Design a protein around this ligand. Structure first.
Ligand SMILES: Nc1ncnc2c1ncn2[C@@H]1O[C@H](COP(=O)(O)O)[C@@H](O)[C@H]1O
Ligand SMILES: Nc1ncnc2c1ncn2[C@@H]1O[C@H](COP(=O)(O)O)[C@@H](O)[C@H]1O
Lengths: 289, 289
C-alpha cells in the first residue's frame, strides 16, 4: 500500500547523518505520534565538535499511521526554512530506528513556557504580542509555501534561545498548491477545541482554518497557557460552535485583542483575516503600547 | 459529517446511568484513545450499594478520531456478552464528559500481569495455556458475532478475579456480517508488530488477521510479556515479513506450541487456523501436560 511504497522508496543524502555520531539523552516529551529526546551530534553539517540537538523518533509499538506521520514531517521539514520554523539538520535511517535530528529549543514548548510564568518569568503584554507576531510571521511564510499546518496550538510552538518562537510538529501538515484545501475523509487526529468549524463538520483544511487555530493559540498566549473552552467536553463543540458561541473575552485582554480572536473565529472562512492582516494587527497593538 | 451525526443522534436508556451515582478515583492507565480510571457506582443495574467498576473517558484534548473511537467501543460493548469479553454496565452522556462504565478486572492488563511473574506470581506452562485458551474462546464468540477485533495484544486483555481473561479495548472493532472483511483506506492506528501481513500491506482486516494477532499474543504469553521482534524497528517489518521471516521459537516453548504460532503467521490467510482449531490445539496441549 502507500506506506510500504514510501518505506522502500525511502530506504533504497543531503540529509543522512551517521548514527555513530549521535548520542541520545533525556526524554523531552511525547506528541501524538513521536517522542522527542535531547541529543548531541558530532560534526553536524560543517559545525566542529558537538552540537546540542533534539531528536524525534517513533514511540514503543508505533502504528502505520505514526510511521507515516513521521516520514511526512521529515518530508515537510526538508522544504522549509524560516527563522520562525523549527530547523531540520538530518536523519538516521540506515541502521536503526528512524530518527529526525532537529534544532533544539531550550525553553521547550510555548505552553509549558507560558504556564511557568506570570503577567506584570514575568511577561509584559508586549512580550505576548511579540510571541504571537513571530508565530504569525511563520504562518504567512508557510501559507505562501502553500502548506496547511493543521495542528497549530501552544504545545506545538517551541521557545528557543532569545525567546524566539519556532513553529513545530509538521506530522500532519499538508501540501495545498493544487487546490488550496486539504480534505480528509476519515476523522482527523487534531484536538477538537483547536479545529475550525468547517474542519470539524466538513473535514476541510485550509490556511483559513489555520487562522482559526491561530485564534485559539492567541487565547492560549493571552491567558498564559489556559485550557480552551474550560470545563466543556469536546463533544459539546459541535453544537456550541454551530449555534454561534465562542470563548468569552479572557482577563488581561484588551478590546482590540479580543476583536482579533473573534475575527479568527468567524463562521465564514473568507471573513477571517489572513496571516498578513494578523501580523499587521499585532504590530499595530505593539506600537500603541 | 459522520461524527456530528453520531454525536447529535446519541445526545437526542437501557444504558444511561446517573452521573451523581458514580464516584471516580485513581487512573488505571491510558490506551490509544481513552483513559481508564478506577471508579465506584451506586445502585448499578439492580446491585444494592456500591460496585467497584472501571470507567473509560476521553483524554485531555481528544481529537474527532478519539471521540469516534470511544462512541464505537460503546456501540460494540452493547451487543456483546461472553464470560471472556469485558462487560459493559452503562454510560454517562447527559451532563458532563462521556464516560463508559465497564467491569473492573482487578489484575489489570495481561501484559503487566505476566511481566510481574516468573515461570516454574509463579506460573506453570499450564496456566499460560489456560490463558491463551480463554482468550481463544472469546475470539471464537466474536468471530461468530461477525466482529473483527483488530487490536488483539497482551495490553488489551485484562485479568479479572479468579485469573479470568477478558478481551478488552473495542474502539477499533468492526462489523463484518456483510462482506467478511473490513478494509480501511488510510493508515491503521494498530501497532505494526501485531498486524497481519495483508493488513500491513493491503489494509484488509478479517477474522483471519485477528488470528495473526493472536499468534503474536501467544508469543507474548509464552515469553511472559516479552516485546515482539525485539530490537527490530517497525519500519523493517514490511520487508522482513514479505521475505518470509517470522519470530524465532522463544525459550520455554514446546515444539507443538511454536508450530501453532507459525501457523497463525502463514502468509496465506486461509492457511491459518480458525479460533475453533486454535482452541482445540490448546486443549490438546493442556491434557498432555
Ligand atoms: N526541538 C525541540 N526542542 C525541545 N523540546 C522539544 C522539541 N520538539 C519537541 N519537543 C518537546 O516534546 C514534545 C512533543 O513534540 P511533538 O511530538 O513534535 O509535538 C513537545 O511538546 C515539546 O515538549
Ligand atoms: N476494566 C479495566 N479494569 C482495570 N484496568 C483497566 C480496565 N480497562 C483498561 N484498564 C487499564 O487501562 C489501560 C488502557 O485501556 P484501553 O484504553 O481500553 O486500552 C489498560 O491497558 C489497562 O492497564
Amino acid at each position: 500500500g502507500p506506506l510500504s511504497l514510501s518505506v522502500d522508496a525511502f530506504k533504497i543524502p543531503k540529509w543522512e547523518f551517521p548514527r555513530k555520531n549521535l548520542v541520545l539523552g533525556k526524554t523531552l516529551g511525547e506528541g501524538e505520534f513521536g517522542k522527542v529526546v535531547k541529543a548531541t551530534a558530532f560534526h553536524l553539517k560543517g559545525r566542529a565538535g558537538y552540537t546540542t540537538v533534539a531528536v524525534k523518533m517513533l514511540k514503543e509499538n508505533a502504528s502505520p499511521s505514526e510511521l507515516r506521520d513521521l516520514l511526512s514531517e521529515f518530508n515537510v521539514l526538508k522544504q522549509v526554512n524560516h527563522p520562525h520554523v523549527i530547523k531540520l539538520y538530518g536523519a538516521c535511517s540506515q541502521d536503526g530506528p528512524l530518527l529526525l535530528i532537529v534544532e533544539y529549543a531550550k525553553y521547550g514548548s510555548l505552553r509549558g513556557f507560558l504556564r511557568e510564568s506570570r503577567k506584570v518569568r514575568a511577561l509584559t503584554m508586549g512580550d505576548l504580542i511579540s510571541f504571537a507576531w513571530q508565530i504569525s510571521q511563520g504562518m504567512q511564510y508557510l501559507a505562501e509555501m502553500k502548506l496547511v499546518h493543521r495542528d497549530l496550538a501552544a504545545r506545538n510552538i517551541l521557545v528557543a534561545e532569545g525567546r524566539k518562537m519556532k513553529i513545530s510538529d509538521f506530522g500532519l501538515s499538508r501540501d495545498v498548491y493544487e487546490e488550496d484545501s486539504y480534505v480528509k475523509r476519515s476523522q482527523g487526529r487534531i484536538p477538537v477545541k483547536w479545529m475550525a468549524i468547517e474542519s470539524l463538520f466538513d473535514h476541510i483544511y485550509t490556511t483559513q482554518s489555520d487562522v482559526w487555530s491561530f485564534g485559539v493559540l492567541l487565547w492560549e498566549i493571552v491567558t498564559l497557557g489556559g485550557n480552551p473552552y474550560p470545563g466543556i467536553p469536546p463533544e459539546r463543540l459541535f453544537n456550541l460552535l454551530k449555534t454561534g458561541h465562542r470563548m468569552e473575552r479572557p482577563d488581561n485582554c484588551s478590546e482590540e485583542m479580543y476583536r482579533l480572536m473573534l475575527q479568527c473565529w468567524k463562521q465564514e472562512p473568507d471573513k477571517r483575516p489572513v496571516f498578513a492582516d494578523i501580523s499587521k494587527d499585532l504590530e499595530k497593538m505593539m506600537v500603541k503600547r
